[PDB]
């Protein structure tokens, strides 16, 4: 009973961590785009 | 100017798609845990 | 025991649904930016 | 052109911040469930 709930909890937490990693990468790409757009605005 | 903005937009959207895929996997693991907990409650 | 695990499962699932809603909104803002950038590229 | 691209970028980043906040809440609920399951296993 509890053994299997814990196995499934660990699978949830594994997937959570993959989501957190991909989210930081997305944040970085979005922030890079923002810096570039801002640069092009400033330089004209 | 615009060429590079589009390149960076495509990289954002690539990362977004990977986020959507990992989110469906997370949803599935959470839904599976919920179904199991509910099963054990009913039993 | 199991009663409390189910209460906490429902809180996880509540937060999951809020994450899914915010994610669709983020996708829409990103897709709108893409359409605008593409428009400005095409029109020159 | 660029003014509107920046306006839309700010709206993307606003939504991103709301996603980060909801993600920490989700992480907390998941971590709380894990700690409880572990506690009940140990007991």
mmCIF file with all atom_site columns, C-alpha atoms in Angstrom:
data_model
loop_
_atom_site.group_PDB
_atom_site.id
_atom_site.type_symbol
_atom_site.label_atom_id
_atom_site.label_alt_id
_atom_site.label_comp_id
_atom_site.label_asym_id
_atom_site.label_entity_id
_atom_site.label_seq_id
_atom_site.pdbx_PDB_ins_code
_atom_site.Cartn_x
_atom_site.Cartn_y
_atom_site.Cartn_z
_atom_site.occupancy
_atom_site.B_iso_or_equiv
_atom_site.pdbx_formal_charge
_atom_site.auth_seq_id
_atom_site.auth_comp_id
_atom_site.auth_asym_id
_atom_site.auth_atom_id
_atom_site.pdbx_PDB_model_num
ATOM 1   C CA . UNK A 1 1  ? 0.000   0.000  0.000   1.00 0.00 ? 1  UNK A CA 1
ATOM 2   C CA . UNK A 1 2  ? 2.250   2.845  1.324   1.00 0.00 ? 2  UNK A CA 1
ATOM 3   C CA . UNK A 1 3  ? 5.327   1.371  -0.512  1.00 0.00 ? 3  UNK A CA 1
ATOM 4   C CA . UNK A 1 4  ? 3.584   1.893  -3.926  1.00 0.00 ? 4  UNK A CA 1
ATOM 5   C CA . UNK A 1 5  ? 2.312   5.420  -2.952  1.00 0.00 ? 5  UNK A CA 1
ATOM 6   C CA . UNK A 1 6  ? 5.988   6.346  -2.189  1.00 0.00 ? 6  UNK A CA 1
ATOM 7   C CA . UNK A 1 7  ? 7.199   4.853  -5.538  1.00 0.00 ? 7  UNK A CA 1
ATOM 8   C CA . UNK A 1 8  ? 4.577   7.014  -7.379  1.00 0.00 ? 8  UNK A CA 1
ATOM 9   C CA . UNK A 1 9  ? 5.507   10.083 -5.189  1.00 0.00 ? 9  UNK A CA 1
ATOM 10  C CA . UNK A 1 10 ? 9.178   9.688  -6.295  1.00 0.00 ? 10 UNK A CA 1
ATOM 11  C CA . UNK A 1 11 ? 8.026   9.572  -9.998  1.00 0.00 ? 11 UNK A CA 1
ATOM 12  C CA . UNK A 1 12 ? 5.988   12.803 -9.439  1.00 0.00 ? 12 UNK A CA 1
ATOM 13  C CA . UNK A 1 13 ? 9.065   14.475 -7.809  1.00 0.00 ? 13 UNK A CA 1
ATOM 14  C CA . UNK A 1 14 ? 11.380  13.255 -10.654 1.00 0.00 ? 14 UNK A CA 1
ATOM 15  C CA . UNK A 1 15 ? 9.034   14.864 -13.258 1.00 0.00 ? 15 UNK A CA 1
ATOM 16  C CA . UNK A 1 16 ? 8.706   18.028 -11.083 1.00 0.00 ? 16 UNK A CA 1
ATOM 17  C CA . UNK A 1 17 ? 12.521  18.454 -11.135 1.00 0.00 ? 17 UNK A CA 1
ATOM 18  C CA . UNK A 1 18 ? 12.624  18.054 -14.980 1.00 0.00 ? 18 UNK A CA 1
ATOM 19  C CA . UNK A 1 19 ? 9.859   20.756 -15.156 1.00 0.00 ? 19 UNK A CA 1
ATOM 20  C CA . UNK A 1 20 ? 11.900  23.114 -12.887 1.00 0.00 ? 20 UNK A CA 1
ATOM 21  C CA . UNK A 1 21 ? 15.060  22.629 -15.082 1.00 0.00 ? 21 UNK A CA 1
ATOM 22  C CA . UNK A 1 22 ? 13.130  23.288 -18.359 1.00 0.00 ? 22 UNK A CA 1
ATOM 23  C CA . UNK A 1 23 ? 11.420  26.345 -16.721 1.00 0.00 ? 23 UNK A CA 1
ATOM 24  C CA . UNK A 1 24 ? 14.802  28.004 -15.832 1.00 0.00 ? 24 UNK A CA 1
ATOM 25  C CA . UNK A 1 25 ? 15.973  27.417 -19.476 1.00 0.00 ? 25 UNK A CA 1
ATOM 26  C CA . UNK A 1 26 ? 12.706  29.001 -20.797 1.00 0.00 ? 26 UNK A CA 1
ATOM 27  C CA . UNK A 1 27 ? 13.177  31.990 -18.384 1.00 0.00 ? 27 UNK A CA 1
ATOM 28  C CA . UNK A 1 28 ? 16.776  32.436 -19.740 1.00 0.00 ? 28 UNK A CA 1
ATOM 29  C CA . UNK A 1 29 ? 15.662  32.357 -23.455 1.00 0.00 ? 29 UNK A CA 1
ATOM 30  C CA . UNK A 1 30 ? 12.844  34.883 -22.677 1.00 0.00 ? 30 UNK A CA 1
ATOM 31  C CA . UNK A 1 31 ? 15.280  37.152 -20.714 1.00 0.00 ? 31 UNK A CA 1
ATOM 32  C CA . UNK A 1 32 ? 17.840  36.923 -23.598 1.00 0.00 ? 32 UNK A CA 1
ATOM 33  C CA . UNK A 1 33 ? 15.109  37.953 -26.141 1.00 0.00 ? 33 UNK A CA 1
ATOM 34  C CA . UNK A 1 34 ? 14.143  40.878 -23.797 1.00 0.00 ? 34 UNK A CA 1
ATOM 35  C CA . UNK A 1 35 ? 17.789  42.078 -23.538 1.00 0.00 ? 35 UNK A CA 1
ATOM 36  C CA . UNK A 1 36 ? 18.159  41.894 -27.378 1.00 0.00 ? 36 UNK A CA 1
ATOM 37  C CA . UNK A 1 37 ? 14.847  43.746 -28.077 1.00 0.00 ? 37 UNK A CA 1
ATOM 38  C CA . UNK A 1 38 ? 15.853  46.395 -25.456 1.00 0.00 ? 38 UNK A CA 1
ATOM 39  C CA . UNK A 1 39 ? 19.329  46.724 -27.099 1.00 0.00 ? 39 UNK A CA 1
ATOM 40  C CA . UNK A 1 40 ? 17.727  47.291 -30.582 1.00 0.00 ? 40 UNK A CA 1
ATOM 41  C CA . UNK A 1 41 ? 15.305  49.881 -29.038 1.00 0.00 ? 41 UNK A CA 1
ATOM 42  C CA . UNK A 1 42 ? 18.183  51.786 -27.306 1.00 0.00 ? 42 UNK A CA 1
ATOM 43  C CA . UNK A 1 43 ? 20.450  51.753 -30.425 1.00 0.00 ? 43 UNK A CA 1
ATOM 44  C CA . UNK A 1 44 ? 18.616  53.966 -33.028 1.00 0.00 ? 44 UNK A CA 1
ATOM 45  C CA . UNK B 2 1  ? 17.663  43.485 -36.097 1.00 0.00 ? 1  UNK B CA 1
ATOM 46  C CA . UNK B 2 2  ? 14.356  41.623 -36.784 1.00 0.00 ? 2  UNK B CA 1
ATOM 47  C CA . UNK B 2 3  ? 16.096  38.443 -38.132 1.00 0.00 ? 3  UNK B CA 1
ATOM 48  C CA . UNK B 2 4  ? 17.845  37.918 -34.730 1.00 0.00 ? 4  UNK B CA 1
ATOM 49  C CA . UNK B 2 5  ? 14.626  38.742 -32.740 1.00 0.00 ? 5  UNK B CA 1
ATOM 50  C CA . UNK B 2 6  ? 12.851  35.957 -34.753 1.00 0.00 ? 6  UNK B CA 1
ATOM 51  C CA . UNK B 2 7  ? 15.766  33.488 -34.134 1.00 0.00 ? 7  UNK B CA 1
ATOM 52  C CA . UNK B 2 8  ? 15.467  34.169 -30.341 1.00 0.00 ? 8  UNK B CA 1
ATOM 53  C CA . UNK B 2 9  ? 11.604  33.920 -30.529 1.00 0.00 ? 9  UNK B CA 1
ATOM 54  C CA . UNK B 2 10 ? 11.956  30.432 -32.156 1.00 0.00 ? 10 UNK B CA 1
ATOM 55  C CA . UNK B 2 11 ? 14.303  29.364 -29.268 1.00 0.00 ? 11 UNK B CA 1
ATOM 56  C CA . UNK B 2 12 ? 11.741  30.617 -26.677 1.00 0.00 ? 12 UNK B CA 1
ATOM 57  C CA . UNK B 2 13 ? 8.973   28.641 -28.491 1.00 0.00 ? 13 UNK B CA 1
ATOM 58  C CA . UNK B 2 14 ? 11.250  25.511 -28.691 1.00 0.00 ? 14 UNK B CA 1
ATOM 59  C CA . UNK B 2 15 ? 11.729  25.687 -24.853 1.00 0.00 ? 15 UNK B CA 1
ATOM 60  C CA . UNK B 2 16 ? 7.949   26.325 -24.414 1.00 0.00 ? 16 UNK B CA 1
ATOM 61  C CA . UNK B 2 17 ? 7.163   23.084 -26.343 1.00 0.00 ? 17 UNK B CA 1
ATOM 62  C CA . UNK B 2 18 ? 9.600   21.083 -24.106 1.00 0.00 ? 18 UNK B CA 1
ATOM 63  C CA . UNK B 2 19 ? 7.826   22.651 -21.045 1.00 0.00 ? 19 UNK B CA 1
ATOM 64  C CA . UNK B 2 20 ? 4.395   21.544 -22.433 1.00 0.00 ? 20 UNK B CA 1
ATOM 65  C CA . UNK B 2 21 ? 5.704   17.938 -22.948 1.00 0.00 ? 21 UNK B CA 1
ATOM 66  C CA . UNK B 2 22 ? 7.235   17.731 -19.408 1.00 0.00 ? 22 UNK B CA 1
ATOM 67  C CA . UNK B 2 23 ? 4.003   19.269 -17.957 1.00 0.00 ? 23 UNK B CA 1
ATOM 68  C CA . UNK B 2 24 ? 1.816   16.483 -19.492 1.00 0.00 ? 24 UNK B CA 1
ATOM 69  C CA . UNK B 2 25 ? 4.273   13.865 -18.011 1.00 0.00 ? 25 UNK B CA 1
ATOM 70  C CA . UNK B 2 26 ? 4.007   15.566 -14.558 1.00 0.00 ? 26 UNK B CA 1
ATOM 71  C CA . UNK B 2 27 ? 0.161   15.682 -14.904 1.00 0.00 ? 27 UNK B CA 1
ATOM 72  C CA . UNK B 2 28 ? 0.165   11.898 -15.719 1.00 0.00 ? 28 UNK B CA 1
ATOM 73  C CA . UNK B 2 29 ? 2.345   10.954 -12.673 1.00 0.00 ? 29 UNK B CA 1
ATOM 74  C CA . UNK B 2 30 ? 0.154   13.153 -10.370 1.00 0.00 ? 30 UNK B CA 1
ATOM 75  C CA . UNK B 2 31 ? -3.098  11.675 -11.841 1.00 0.00 ? 31 UNK B CA 1
ATOM 76  C CA . UNK B 2 32 ? -1.708  8.099  -11.442 1.00 0.00 ? 32 UNK B CA 1
ATOM 77  C CA . UNK B 2 33 ? -0.804  8.787  -7.749  1.00 0.00 ? 33 UNK B CA 1
ATOM 78  C CA . UNK B 2 34 ? -4.327  10.264 -7.170  1.00 0.00 ? 34 UNK B CA 1
ATOM 79  C CA . UNK B 2 35 ? -6.050  7.204  -8.726  1.00 0.00 ? 35 UNK B CA 1
ATOM 80  C CA . UNK B 2 36 ? -3.881  4.844  -6.577  1.00 0.00 ? 36 UNK B CA 1
ATOM 81  C CA . UNK B 2 37 ? -4.555  6.801  -3.311  1.00 0.00 ? 37 UNK B CA 1
ATOM 82  C CA . UNK B 2 38 ? -8.327  6.818  -4.152  1.00 0.00 ? 38 UNK B CA 1
ATOM 83  C CA . UNK B 2 39 ? -8.208  3.033  -4.899  1.00 0.00 ? 39 UNK B CA 1
ATOM 84  C CA . UNK B 2 40 ? -6.538  2.292  -1.496  1.00 0.00 ? 40 UNK B CA 1
ATOM 85  C CA . UNK B 2 41 ? -9.102  4.553  0.290   1.00 0.00 ? 41 UNK B CA 1
ATOM 86  C CA . UNK B 2 42 ? -12.012 2.647  -1.388  1.00 0.00 ? 42 UNK B CA 1
ATOM 87  C CA . UNK B 2 43 ? -10.187 -0.607 -0.286  1.00 0.00 ? 43 UNK B CA 1
ATOM 88  C CA . UNK C 3 1  ? -3.545  8.084  7.378   1.00 0.00 ? 1  UNK C CA 1
ATOM 89  C CA . UNK C 3 2  ? -4.966  7.647  3.814   1.00 0.00 ? 2  UNK C CA 1
ATOM 90  C CA . UNK C 3 3  ? -7.594  10.425 4.437   1.00 0.00 ? 3  UNK C CA 1
ATOM 91  C CA . UNK C 3 4  ? -4.775  13.025 4.946   1.00 0.00 ? 4  UNK C CA 1
ATOM 92  C CA . UNK C 3 5  ? -2.746  11.700 1.926   1.00 0.00 ? 5  UNK C CA 1
ATOM 93  C CA . UNK C 3 6  ? -5.907  12.267 -0.227  1.00 0.00 ? 6  UNK C CA 1
ATOM 94  C CA . UNK C 3 7  ? -6.410  15.816 1.209   1.00 0.00 ? 7  UNK C CA 1
ATOM 95  C CA . UNK C 3 8  ? -2.757  16.650 0.264   1.00 0.00 ? 8  UNK C CA 1
ATOM 96  C CA . UNK C 3 9  ? -3.217  14.944 -3.194  1.00 0.00 ? 9  UNK C CA 1
ATOM 97  C CA . UNK C 3 10 ? -6.230  17.252 -3.868  1.00 0.00 ? 10 UNK C CA 1
ATOM 98  C CA . UNK C 3 11 ? -4.060  20.324 -2.914  1.00 0.00 ? 11 UNK C CA 1
ATOM 99  C CA . UNK C 3 12 ? -1.325  19.118 -5.357  1.00 0.00 ? 12 UNK C CA 1
ATOM 100 C CA . UNK C 3 13 ? -3.980  18.671 -8.127  1.00 0.00 ? 13 UNK C CA 1
ATOM 101 C CA . UNK C 3 14 ? -5.522  22.133 -7.367  1.00 0.00 ? 14 UNK C CA 1
ATOM 102 C CA . UNK C 3 15 ? -2.058  23.774 -7.787  1.00 0.00 ? 15 UNK C CA 1
ATOM 103 C CA . UNK C 3 16 ? -1.373  21.645 -10.925 1.00 0.00 ? 16 UNK C CA 1
ATOM 104 C CA . UNK C 3 17 ? -4.567  23.022 -12.550 1.00 0.00 ? 17 UNK C CA 1
ATOM 105 C CA . UNK C 3 18 ? -3.555  26.660 -11.717 1.00 0.00 ? 18 UNK C CA 1
ATOM 106 C CA . UNK C 3 19 ? -0.125  25.888 -13.336 1.00 0.00 ? 19 UNK C CA 1
ATOM 107 C CA . UNK C 3 20 ? -1.837  24.487 -16.496 1.00 0.00 ? 20 UNK C CA 1
ATOM 108 C CA . UNK C 3 21 ? -4.079  27.638 -16.782 1.00 0.00 ? 21 UNK C CA 1
ATOM 109 C CA . UNK C 3 22 ? -1.092  30.047 -16.359 1.00 0.00 ? 22 UNK C CA 1
ATOM 110 C CA . UNK C 3 23 ? 0.946   27.942 -18.881 1.00 0.00 ? 23 UNK C CA 1
ATOM 111 C CA . UNK C 3 24 ? -1.743  28.295 -21.643 1.00 0.00 ? 24 UNK C CA 1
ATOM 112 C CA . UNK C 3 25 ? -1.801  32.114 -21.006 1.00 0.00 ? 25 UNK C CA 1
ATOM 113 C CA . UNK C 3 26 ? 2.052   32.232 -21.268 1.00 0.00 ? 26 UNK C CA 1
ATOM 114 C CA . UNK C 3 27 ? 1.895   30.157 -24.531 1.00 0.00 ? 27 UNK C CA 1
ATOM 115 C CA . UNK C 3 28 ? -0.681  32.682 -25.938 1.00 0.00 ? 28 UNK C CA 1
ATOM 116 C CA . UNK C 3 29 ? 1.472   35.778 -25.031 1.00 0.00 ? 29 UNK C CA 1
ATOM 117 C CA . UNK C 3 30 ? 4.579   34.091 -26.589 1.00 0.00 ? 30 UNK C CA 1
ATOM 118 C CA . UNK C 3 31 ? 2.588   33.113 -29.753 1.00 0.00 ? 31 UNK C CA 1
ATOM 119 C CA . UNK C 3 32 ? 1.186   36.705 -29.998 1.00 0.00 ? 32 UNK C CA 1
ATOM 120 C CA . UNK C 3 33 ? 4.769   38.149 -29.757 1.00 0.00 ? 33 UNK C CA 1
ATOM 121 C CA . UNK C 3 34 ? 5.878   35.640 -32.487 1.00 0.00 ? 34 UNK C CA 1
ATOM 122 C CA . UNK C 3 35 ? 3.001   36.672 -34.823 1.00 0.00 ? 35 UNK C CA 1
ATOM 123 C CA . UNK C 3 36 ? 3.851   40.400 -34.280 1.00 0.00 ? 36 UNK C CA 1
ATOM 124 C CA . UNK C 3 37 ? 7.636   39.922 -34.858 1.00 0.00 ? 37 UNK C CA 1
ATOM 125 C CA . UNK C 3 38 ? 6.823   37.833 -38.001 1.00 0.00 ? 38 UNK C CA 1
ATOM 126 C CA . UNK C 3 39 ? 4.408   40.584 -39.222 1.00 0.00 ? 39 UNK C CA 1
ATOM 127 C CA . UNK C 3 40 ? 7.140   43.298 -38.793 1.00 0.00 ? 40 UNK C CA 1
ATOM 128 C CA . UNK C 3 41 ? 9.673   41.031 -40.636 1.00 0.00 ? 41 UNK C CA 1
ATOM 129 C CA . UNK C 3 42 ? 7.240   40.421 -43.573 1.00 0.00 ? 42 UNK C CA 1
ATOM 130 C CA . UNK C 3 43 ? 6.240   44.132 -43.877 1.00 0.00 ? 43 UNK C CA 1
ATOM 131 C CA . UNK C 3 44 ? 9.464   45.955 -45.027 1.00 0.00 ? 44 UNK C CA 1
ATOM 132 C CA . UNK D 4 1  ? 7.656   48.417 -34.499 1.00 0.00 ? 1  UNK D CA 1
ATOM 133 C CA . UNK D 4 2  ? 10.143  47.899 -31.597 1.00 0.00 ? 2  UNK D CA 1
ATOM 134 C CA . UNK D 4 3  ? 7.942   49.741 -29.005 1.00 0.00 ? 3  UNK D CA 1
ATOM 135 C CA . UNK D 4 4  ? 5.122   47.154 -29.511 1.00 0.00 ? 4  UNK D CA 1
ATOM 136 C CA . UNK D 4 5  ? 7.599   44.177 -29.499 1.00 0.00 ? 5  UNK D CA 1
ATOM 137 C CA . UNK D 4 6  ? 8.846   45.426 -26.056 1.00 0.00 ? 6  UNK D CA 1
ATOM 138 C CA . UNK D 4 7  ? 5.222   45.837 -24.762 1.00 0.00 ? 7  UNK D CA 1
ATOM 139 C CA . UNK D 4 8  ? 4.497   42.183 -25.788 1.00 0.00 ? 8  UNK D CA 1
ATOM 140 C CA . UNK D 4 9  ? 7.872   41.015 -24.283 1.00 0.00 ? 9  UNK D CA 1
ATOM 141 C CA . UNK D 4 10 ? 6.877   42.635 -20.919 1.00 0.00 ? 10 UNK D CA 1
ATOM 142 C CA . UNK D 4 11 ? 3.508   40.733 -21.043 1.00 0.00 ? 11 UNK D CA 1
ATOM 143 C CA . UNK D 4 12 ? 5.361   37.424 -21.722 1.00 0.00 ? 12 UNK D CA 1
ATOM 144 C CA . UNK D 4 13 ? 7.698   38.148 -18.742 1.00 0.00 ? 13 UNK D CA 1
ATOM 145 C CA . UNK D 4 14 ? 4.672   39.101 -16.518 1.00 0.00 ? 14 UNK D CA 1
ATOM 146 C CA . UNK D 4 15 ? 3.071   35.669 -17.327 1.00 0.00 ? 15 UNK D CA 1
ATOM 147 C CA . UNK D 4 16 ? 6.479   33.951 -16.760 1.00 0.00 ? 16 UNK D CA 1
ATOM 148 C CA . UNK D 4 17 ? 6.669   35.461 -13.221 1.00 0.00 ? 17 UNK D CA 1
ATOM 149 C CA . UNK D 4 18 ? 3.107   34.193 -12.418 1.00 0.00 ? 18 UNK D CA 1
ATOM 150 C CA . UNK D 4 19 ? 4.224   30.719 -13.706 1.00 0.00 ? 19 UNK D CA 1
ATOM 151 C CA . UNK D 4 20 ? 7.309   30.821 -11.382 1.00 0.00 ? 20 UNK D CA 1
ATOM 152 C CA . UNK D 4 21 ? 5.071   31.730 -8.358  1.00 0.00 ? 21 UNK D CA 1
ATOM 153 C CA . UNK D 4 22 ? 2.508   28.940 -9.109  1.00 0.00 ? 22 UNK D CA 1
ATOM 154 C CA . UNK D 4 23 ? 5.419   26.469 -9.693  1.00 0.00 ? 23 UNK D CA 1
ATOM 155 C CA . UNK D 4 24 ? 6.873   27.127 -6.179  1.00 0.00 ? 24 UNK D CA 1
ATOM 156 C CA . UNK D 4 25 ? 3.322   26.570 -4.706  1.00 0.00 ? 25 UNK D CA 1
ATOM 157 C CA . UNK D 4 26 ? 3.032   23.253 -6.655  1.00 0.00 ? 26 UNK D CA 1
ATOM 158 C CA . UNK D 4 27 ? 6.570   22.243 -5.478  1.00 0.00 ? 27 UNK D CA 1
ATOM 159 C CA . UNK D 4 28 ? 5.517   22.978 -1.827  1.00 0.00 ? 28 UNK D CA 1
ATOM 160 C CA . UNK D 4 29 ? 2.286   20.871 -2.034  1.00 0.00 ? 29 UNK D CA 1
ATOM 161 C CA . UNK D 4 30 ? 4.234   17.968 -3.683  1.00 0.00 ? 30 UNK D CA 1
ATOM 162 C CA . UNK D 4 31 ? 7.060   18.208 -1.059  1.00 0.00 ? 31 UNK D CA 1
ATOM 163 C CA . UNK D 4 32 ? 4.465   18.287 1.795   1.00 0.00 ? 32 UNK D CA 1
ATOM 164 C CA . UNK D 4 33 ? 2.716   15.143 0.386   1.00 0.00 ? 33 UNK D CA 1
ATOM 165 C CA . UNK D 4 34 ? 6.143   13.389 0.065   1.00 0.00 ? 34 UNK D CA 1
ATOM 166 C CA . UNK D 4 35 ? 7.101   14.226 3.689   1.00 0.00 ? 35 UNK D CA 1
ATOM 167 C CA . UNK D 4 36 ? 3.678   12.944 4.928   1.00 0.00 ? 36 UNK D CA 1
ATOM 168 C CA . UNK D 4 37 ? 3.895   9.663  2.894   1.00 0.00 ? 37 UNK D CA 1
ATOM 169 C CA . UNK D 4 38 ? 7.494   9.143  4.203   1.00 0.00 ? 38 UNK D CA 1
ATOM 170 C CA . UNK D 4 39 ? 6.317   9.854  7.810   1.00 0.00 ? 39 UNK D CA 1
ATOM 171 C CA . UNK D 4 40 ? 3.490   7.237  7.531   1.00 0.00 ? 40 UNK D CA 1
ATOM 172 C CA . UNK D 4 41 ? 5.956   4.689  6.011   1.00 0.00 ? 41 UNK D CA 1
ATOM 173 C CA . UNK D 4 42 ? 8.398   5.238  8.952   1.00 0.00 ? 42 UNK D CA 1
ATOM 174 C CA . UNK D 4 43 ? 5.306   4.811  11.274  1.00 0.00 ? 43 UNK D CA 1
#
